[PDB]
Each structure stands twice: as structure tokens, then as C-alpha cells.
Amino acid sequence: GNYNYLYRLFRKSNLKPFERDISTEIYQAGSTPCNGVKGFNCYFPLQSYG
Amino acid sequence: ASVYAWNRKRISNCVADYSVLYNSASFSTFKCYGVSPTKLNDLCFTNVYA
């Protein structure tokens, strides 16, 4: 398994053309705020291709 | 019901509030495979099999 290539699974909004997002901030996927901490409906945005 | 005789409920001719179902914290797993969880309140379907 080559897991070195990653894609942004989660983001709040669509990018501009030629826009790069490398920010490793947490995403809020539910009503509950995450406060930078993983949990229920709190996921890392970057997941790797298998 | 049991899993060999799973109960099938036909959801039709009604308006469905998926925001209450999605914002509930009692559910330990909420995984969609053909749609988006945040777009369930925006999309329309012919019927739902539960």
C-alpha cells in the first residue's frame, strides 16, 4: 500500500482555479463544534489513496 | 426485526427532515455511499426504502 499520496476529503467550500490548500485544520462535519479536536463528526481533511 | 427478515418501510408522499436525523449524536455510524449528508435536505427522491 502506497499511502504517500493524499487528497482533501473534507472542505467547507470549493476552491478557486489554481488555488492550493495545504492547511491541516480540522473540519466540522456536524452541528457540534470540534475546537481543533477529533471526535464525533470531526474528521481530518486529508486522507490517503490506497 | 432480525437481519434475515429485515423490515422494509416505504417512505413516500411526505417531506423528510434529515437534519434532525443527522444532528442526532446517538448514532455511532452515519456513512453515505451515493449522496452527501449535507445535501439530503436539498435533494429530492421518488421514494425511500428503510
PDB file of C-alpha atoms in Angstrom:
ATOM      1  CA  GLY A   1       0.000   0.000   0.000  1.00  0.00           C
ATOM      2  CA  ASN A   2       1.418   3.337  -1.142  1.00  0.00           C
ATOM      3  CA  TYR A   3      -0.165   5.881   1.211  1.00  0.00           C
ATOM      4  CA  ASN A   4       2.068   8.851   0.357  1.00  0.00           C
ATOM      5  CA  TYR A   5      -0.500  10.464  -1.975  1.00  0.00           C
ATOM      6  CA  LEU A   6      -3.305  12.298  -0.178  1.00  0.00           C
ATOM      7  CA  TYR A   7      -6.468  14.115  -1.225  1.00  0.00           C
ATOM      8  CA  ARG A   8      -8.710  16.581   0.593  1.00  0.00           C
ATOM      9  CA  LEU A   9     -11.796  14.581   1.550  1.00  0.00           C
ATOM     10  CA  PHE A  10     -13.399  17.419   3.528  1.00  0.00           C
ATOM     11  CA  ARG A  11     -13.593  21.169   2.944  1.00  0.00           C
ATOM     12  CA  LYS A  12     -16.108  23.925   3.637  1.00  0.00           C
ATOM     13  CA  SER A  13     -16.106  25.460   0.146  1.00  0.00           C
ATOM     14  CA  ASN A  14     -14.929  24.831  -3.402  1.00  0.00           C
ATOM     15  CA  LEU A  15     -11.545  26.153  -4.476  1.00  0.00           C
ATOM     16  CA  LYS A  16     -10.694  28.918  -6.889  1.00  0.00           C
ATOM     17  CA  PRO A  17      -8.910  27.921 -10.106  1.00  0.00           C
ATOM     18  CA  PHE A  18      -5.171  27.446  -9.415  1.00  0.00           C
ATOM     19  CA  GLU A  19      -5.797  27.547  -5.658  1.00  0.00           C
ATOM     20  CA  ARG A  20      -3.805  25.309  -3.307  1.00  0.00           C
ATOM     21  CA  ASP A  21      -4.947  24.336   0.195  1.00  0.00           C
ATOM     22  CA  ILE A  22      -2.285  22.792   2.444  1.00  0.00           C
ATOM     23  CA  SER A  23      -3.874  23.848   5.754  1.00  0.00           C
ATOM     24  CA  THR A  24      -4.216  20.872   8.120  1.00  0.00           C
ATOM     25  CA  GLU A  25      -7.091  22.288  10.167  1.00  0.00           C
ATOM     26  CA  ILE A  26      -9.933  20.097  11.397  1.00  0.00           C
ATOM     27  CA  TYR A  27     -13.327  20.019   9.681  1.00  0.00           C
ATOM     28  CA  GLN A  28     -16.716  20.298  11.410  1.00  0.00           C
ATOM     29  CA  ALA A  29     -18.979  17.724   9.737  1.00  0.00           C
ATOM     30  CA  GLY A  30     -21.840  18.041  12.240  1.00  0.00           C
ATOM     31  CA  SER A  31     -23.678  20.572  14.397  1.00  0.00           C
ATOM     32  CA  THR A  32     -21.240  20.124  17.295  1.00  0.00           C
ATOM     33  CA  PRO A  33     -18.101  22.307  17.059  1.00  0.00           C
ATOM     34  CA  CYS A  34     -14.815  20.415  17.045  1.00  0.00           C
ATOM     35  CA  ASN A  35     -12.423  23.042  18.534  1.00  0.00           C
ATOM     36  CA  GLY A  36      -9.431  21.514  16.761  1.00  0.00           C
ATOM     37  CA  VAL A  37     -10.092  18.097  18.343  1.00  0.00           C
ATOM     38  CA  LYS A  38     -11.193  14.913  16.582  1.00  0.00           C
ATOM     39  CA  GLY A  39     -14.397  13.264  17.749  1.00  0.00           C
ATOM     40  CA  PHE A  40     -17.976  12.685  16.671  1.00  0.00           C
ATOM     41  CA  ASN A  41     -18.350  14.175  13.153  1.00  0.00           C
ATOM     42  CA  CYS A  42     -14.833  15.654  13.436  1.00  0.00           C
ATOM     43  CA  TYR A  43     -12.552  14.286  10.719  1.00  0.00           C
ATOM     44  CA  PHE A  44      -9.120  15.046   9.323  1.00  0.00           C
ATOM     45  CA  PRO A  45      -9.492  16.595   5.842  1.00  0.00           C
ATOM     46  CA  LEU A  46      -6.533  14.735   4.293  1.00  0.00           C
ATOM     47  CA  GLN A  47      -6.963  11.032   3.530  1.00  0.00           C
ATOM     48  CA  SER A  48      -4.542   8.888   1.563  1.00  0.00           C
ATOM     49  CA  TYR A  49      -5.089   6.867  -1.578  1.00  0.00           C
ATOM     50  CA  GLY A  50      -4.666   3.140  -1.004  1.00  0.00           C
TER      51      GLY A  50
ATOM     52  CA  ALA B   1     -36.597  -7.105  13.388  1.00  0.00           C
ATOM     53  CA  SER B   2     -33.930  -9.728  12.761  1.00  0.00           C
ATOM     54  CA  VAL B   3     -31.445  -9.450   9.903  1.00  0.00           C
ATOM     55  CA  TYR B   4     -32.691 -12.431   7.862  1.00  0.00           C
ATOM     56  CA  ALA B   5     -36.194 -10.873   7.947  1.00  0.00           C
ATOM     57  CA  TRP B   6     -35.300  -7.170   7.917  1.00  0.00           C
ATOM     58  CA  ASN B   7     -38.292  -4.844   7.966  1.00  0.00           C
ATOM     59  CA  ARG B   8     -38.705  -2.738   4.827  1.00  0.00           C
ATOM     60  CA  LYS B   9     -40.587   0.535   5.253  1.00  0.00           C
ATOM     61  CA  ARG B  10     -41.527   2.541   2.166  1.00  0.00           C
ATOM     62  CA  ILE B  11     -41.081   6.280   2.720  1.00  0.00           C
ATOM     63  CA  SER B  12     -43.114   8.193   0.131  1.00  0.00           C
ATOM     64  CA  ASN B  13     -45.603  11.069  -0.302  1.00  0.00           C
ATOM     65  CA  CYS B  14     -44.088  13.070   2.564  1.00  0.00           C
ATOM     66  CA  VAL B  15     -41.417  15.647   3.365  1.00  0.00           C
ATOM     67  CA  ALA B  16     -38.360  14.248   5.137  1.00  0.00           C
ATOM     68  CA  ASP B  17     -36.315  16.199   7.689  1.00  0.00           C
ATOM     69  CA  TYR B  18     -32.866  14.618   7.512  1.00  0.00           C
ATOM     70  CA  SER B  19     -31.309  17.417   9.591  1.00  0.00           C
ATOM     71  CA  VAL B  20     -32.829  16.033  12.807  1.00  0.00           C
ATOM     72  CA  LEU B  21     -31.548  12.547  11.928  1.00  0.00           C
ATOM     73  CA  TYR B  22     -28.077  13.832  11.010  1.00  0.00           C
ATOM     74  CA  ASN B  23     -27.669  16.165  14.006  1.00  0.00           C
ATOM     75  CA  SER B  24     -28.539  13.391  16.480  1.00  0.00           C
ATOM     76  CA  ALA B  25     -25.463  12.352  18.465  1.00  0.00           C
ATOM     77  CA  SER B  26     -26.832   8.937  19.472  1.00  0.00           C
ATOM     78  CA  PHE B  27     -25.852   7.409  16.111  1.00  0.00           C
ATOM     79  CA  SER B  28     -22.380   5.843  16.190  1.00  0.00           C
ATOM     80  CA  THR B  29     -22.193   5.433  12.394  1.00  0.00           C
ATOM     81  CA  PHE B  30     -23.545   7.748   9.667  1.00  0.00           C
ATOM     82  CA  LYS B  31     -21.919   6.746   6.366  1.00  0.00           C
ATOM     83  CA  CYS B  32     -23.360   7.564   2.942  1.00  0.00           C
ATOM     84  CA  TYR B  33     -22.252   5.874  -0.274  1.00  0.00           C
ATOM     85  CA  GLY B  34     -24.185   7.602  -3.071  1.00  0.00           C
ATOM     86  CA  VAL B  35     -25.167  11.044  -1.761  1.00  0.00           C
ATOM     87  CA  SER B  36     -23.906  13.726   0.602  1.00  0.00           C
ATOM     88  CA  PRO B  37     -25.170  14.076   4.200  1.00  0.00           C
ATOM     89  CA  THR B  38     -25.368  17.883   3.997  1.00  0.00           C
ATOM     90  CA  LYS B  39     -27.335  17.744   0.714  1.00  0.00           C
ATOM     91  CA  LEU B  40     -30.070  15.367   1.917  1.00  0.00           C
ATOM     92  CA  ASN B  41     -32.240  18.362   2.855  1.00  0.00           C
ATOM     93  CA  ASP B  42     -31.778  19.841  -0.644  1.00  0.00           C
ATOM     94  CA  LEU B  43     -32.194  16.842  -2.956  1.00  0.00           C
ATOM     95  CA  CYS B  44     -35.477  15.162  -3.871  1.00  0.00           C
ATOM     96  CA  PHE B  45     -36.146  11.455  -4.399  1.00  0.00           C
ATOM     97  CA  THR B  46     -39.087   9.401  -5.623  1.00  0.00           C
ATOM     98  CA  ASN B  47     -39.208   7.074  -2.605  1.00  0.00           C
ATOM     99  CA  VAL B  48     -37.002   5.837   0.234  1.00  0.00           C
ATOM    100  CA  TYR B  49     -36.638   2.206   1.325  1.00  0.00           C
ATOM    101  CA  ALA B  50     -35.795   1.907   5.034  1.00  0.00           C
TER     102      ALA B  50
END
